[PDB]
Design a protein around this nucleic acid. Sequence first.
RNA 1: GAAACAUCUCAGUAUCGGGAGGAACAGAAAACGCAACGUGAUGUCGUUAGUAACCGCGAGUGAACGCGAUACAGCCCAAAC
RNA 2: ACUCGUACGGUCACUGAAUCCUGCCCAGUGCAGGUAUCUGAACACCUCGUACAAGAGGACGAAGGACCUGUCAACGGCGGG
RNA 3: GCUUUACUGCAGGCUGUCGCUGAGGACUCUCACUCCGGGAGGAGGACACCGAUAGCCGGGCA
Lengths: 237, 92, 56, 194
Amino acid sequence: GRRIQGQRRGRGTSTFRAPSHRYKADLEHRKVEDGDVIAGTVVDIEHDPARSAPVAAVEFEDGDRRLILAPEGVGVGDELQVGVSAEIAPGNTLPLAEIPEGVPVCNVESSPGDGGKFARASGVNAQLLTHDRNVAVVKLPSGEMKRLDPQCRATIGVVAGGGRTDKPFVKAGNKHHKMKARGTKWPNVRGVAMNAVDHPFGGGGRQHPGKPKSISRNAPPGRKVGDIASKRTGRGG
Amino acid sequence: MQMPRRFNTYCPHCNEHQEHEVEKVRSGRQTGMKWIDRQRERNSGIGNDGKFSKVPGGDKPTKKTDLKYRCGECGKAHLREGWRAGRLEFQE
Amino acid sequence: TGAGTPSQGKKNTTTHTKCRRCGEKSYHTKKKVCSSCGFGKSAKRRDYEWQSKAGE
Amino acid sequence: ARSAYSYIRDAWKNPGDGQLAELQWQRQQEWRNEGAVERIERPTRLDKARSQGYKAKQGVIVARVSVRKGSARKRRHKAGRRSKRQGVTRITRRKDIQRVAEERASRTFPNLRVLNSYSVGQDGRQKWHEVILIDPNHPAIQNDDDLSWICADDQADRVFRGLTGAGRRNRGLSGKGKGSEKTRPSLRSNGGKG
RNA sequence: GAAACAUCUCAGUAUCGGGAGGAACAGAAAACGCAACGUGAUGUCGUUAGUAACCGCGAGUGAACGCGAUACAGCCCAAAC
RNA sequence: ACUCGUACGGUCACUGAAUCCUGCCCAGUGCAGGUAUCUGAACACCUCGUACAAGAGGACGAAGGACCUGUCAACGGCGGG
RNA sequence: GCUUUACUGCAGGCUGUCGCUGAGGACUCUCACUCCGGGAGGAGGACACCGAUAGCCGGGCA
Ligand SMILES: [Cl-]
Ligand SMILES: [Cl-]
Ligand SMILES: [Cl-]
Ligand SMILES: [Cl-]
Ligand SMILES: [K+]
Ligand SMILES: [Mg+2]
Ligand SMILES: [Mg+2]
Ligand SMILES: [Mg+2]
Ligand SMILES: [Mg+2]
Ligand SMILES: [Mg+2]
Ligand SMILES: [Mg+2]
Ligand SMILES: [Mg+2]
Ligand SMILES: [Mg+2]
Ligand SMILES: [Mg+2]
Ligand SMILES: [Mg+2]
Ligand SMILES: [Mg+2]
Ligand SMILES: [Mg+2]
Ligand SMILES: [Mg+2]
Ligand SMILES: [Mg+2]
Ligand SMILES: [Mg+2]
Ligand SMILES: [Mg+2]
Ligand SMILES: [Mg+2]
Ligand code: NA
Ligand code: NA
Ligand code: NA
Ligand code: NA
Ligand code: NA
Ligand code: NA
Ligand code: NA
Ligand code: NA
Ligand SMILES: [Sr+2]
Ligand SMILES: [Sr+2]
Ligand SMILES: [Sr+2]
Ligand SMILES: [Sr+2]
Ligand SMILES: [Sr+2]
Ligand SMILES: [Sr+2]
Ligand SMILES: [Sr+2]
Ligand SMILES: [Sr+2]
Ligand SMILES: [Sr+2]
Ligand SMILES: [Sr+2]
Ligand SMILES: [Sr+2]
Ligand SMILES: [Sr+2]
Ligand SMILES: [Sr+2]
């Protein structure tokens, strides 16, 4: 047949790419040697085209203008501290060791000094639970207990822009606009509505899949469609 | 059909009549050193192998008798023409 | 709209132009490559064995 | 008596034993962080270099080349192919890694000509070969009664035409008798059946 | 082509990448093995021969040594000291 | 590439606004989890074999399979008497 | 051209084994190698990646 849509994706053509040239900043944490004497004042609160959540413009003590991931409640004029012995205030970045247990945290690092990987979407938060000299157990937004290094930096508080998923898109045009700002080809034509040549579920006199939808993990790209390695399907049982 | 285990018949080796013992020919094991074995190893590469990609065929509804006629004196056996038999059981 | 005569009216783009190297009207001014001699693509001149019959 | 050279030779007979084992474990760490073709002042194997033709003279260059380990880096057929010609994984190239090395070296040095090459080891993913290259234009060679042959017009680009010892060995030209019916005088003359 | 077809065949052909010359390549035996008390670098030509060998042992594929010719030409390193 | 992205994410599919709802079936097929036991290739190892080798047998045994379980808004099924 | 539990194969995935590969049937380590860090240094670690081979799945493709 012909290569399926998921195969055209990896080629990285214009249609499947993200409008990077229209994106503001790659939100990473500031690189401090040691100490704490790094503080800044929030100049502006901007809209980030990349994640739909707001982003805070901060100017530091050493005169560095960089955008940072905005938590809830952080406004213009406010002072945020970054360092080891930073004040345990919402919006401050300090390693997981220094942050007390049972406190909601965002922009958590994987390997210490990477700039933040986990809990970065609108209104989400990671929960810090257990402490040790070796490990800091953080409960990520998916409900998974991630065992992390205590030297991994994290910003205190939940991410701003919460409850975005609550209000519906209502009309196709609103989805259109959102998708034109992301790295996604939209709209989605069902495989079952295509020809046999185009997709494993294409063909027939009526629209139904050919074989069962639950595909094996070992399936090759071109065949791996539908329910990928499903442990189960349905709602009941 | 029934077949006697021991009976008097001609021996092409001894050139006279003697008592022969009838035994079913047991399949002798393969060495894996014959020319056809070396050709399977040589001629098999990428893709189809021709004759070495073929799988063994079916069976006939009834097989012929595969027997050995062992002489009672000199102890030398001879082969005879087989006949179609559904089952061949020996007497004594 | 027909793919024939009415689609011919939009054809006012200039692509193939006179080539600096070979002199043929094959220099694609958008690709900056010559379709005849390979100027812009290779230092060597575009020649292929299929430009003639196998035994010639 | 034994030469000092014979000791470098005897060491390289077993590159995984003795002092050389430690020397390779150390040197390869630096080599892995070097380029594809790296010119070196002095050969790692002096005996082999001298045996192959190297002289500590002007216009005699040595370079280390790293080429990847394994079979062919081949693309699968995008058109109709019979079962036999449908292979990707088990296909290997008809030129050995030593020859790919000699060629990469001669291209980095468009004025020099390949004299010979030798293996200097491998790790799990790449192989290293040092190539002795000669300057046909330097009078230090044009007057050398041992190396001036390489200055002839017909020795131009000799590696790409398989005129190297590694070339001639890979072309099946070693034997003078039985088994070399389709190799001598050339593979092309024998309809490419070598 | 095999009166289908997969090994095989078309064919190492078409086509593609790299490169030299006026010609290229080969070349002075870790050869041959008419087994000899024999030959004596290498190409090429004639023959050996559709022979040996290969092969769904199908269709097909296919040398060499030797011989007769052409032309002839034999040398340099590494190491020992 | 997705990605100046990080689960309020984005990938892969199905259904097709709202409203009222969405029953029963895990035997087959699919996917996934488990598995005492059975089955399960090569390397290494042991026995025979061969002054060596081919080769024959054994021992151990991965994924997978057998077997068990989960799953139908997974393929689909919902009859005869 | 297209389909599949048609024939034969080819990619791909999973898995064992050999090489890279090191010190002291379960375990410790650090020196190769990998990743994070601008750096100091940190995480991981003879595994993973890669090369090779074997078994299973394999209309994704021929
Ligand atoms: Cl969305
Ligand atoms: Cl019988
Ligand atoms: Cl060269
Ligand atoms: Cl002779
Ligand atoms: K064919
Ligand atoms: Mg960022
Ligand atoms: Mg939605
Ligand atoms: Mg768009
Ligand atoms: Mg749709
Ligand atoms: Mg249609
Ligand atoms: Mg298909
Ligand atoms: Mg429908
Ligand atoms: Mg439907
Ligand atoms: Mg054909
Ligand atoms: Mg010639
Ligand atoms: Mg035909
Ligand atoms: Mg036939
Ligand atoms: Mg042939
Ligand atoms: Mg011969
Ligand atoms: Mg519809
Ligand atoms: Mg990196
Ligand atoms: Mg097909
Ligand atoms: Na063969
Ligand atoms: Na050169
Ligand atoms: Na050959
Ligand atoms: Na025919
Ligand atoms: Na046909
Ligand atoms: Na054949
Ligand atoms: Na069922
Ligand atoms: Na058609
Ligand atoms: Sr970075
Ligand atoms: Sr980051
Ligand atoms: Sr269908
Ligand atoms: Sr239900
Ligand atoms: Sr073969
Ligand atoms: Sr095969
Ligand atoms: Sr039958
Ligand atoms: Sr136009
Ligand atoms: Sr170009
Ligand atoms: Sr050309
Ligand atoms: Sr040149
Ligand atoms: Sr002569
Ligand atoms: Sr089931």
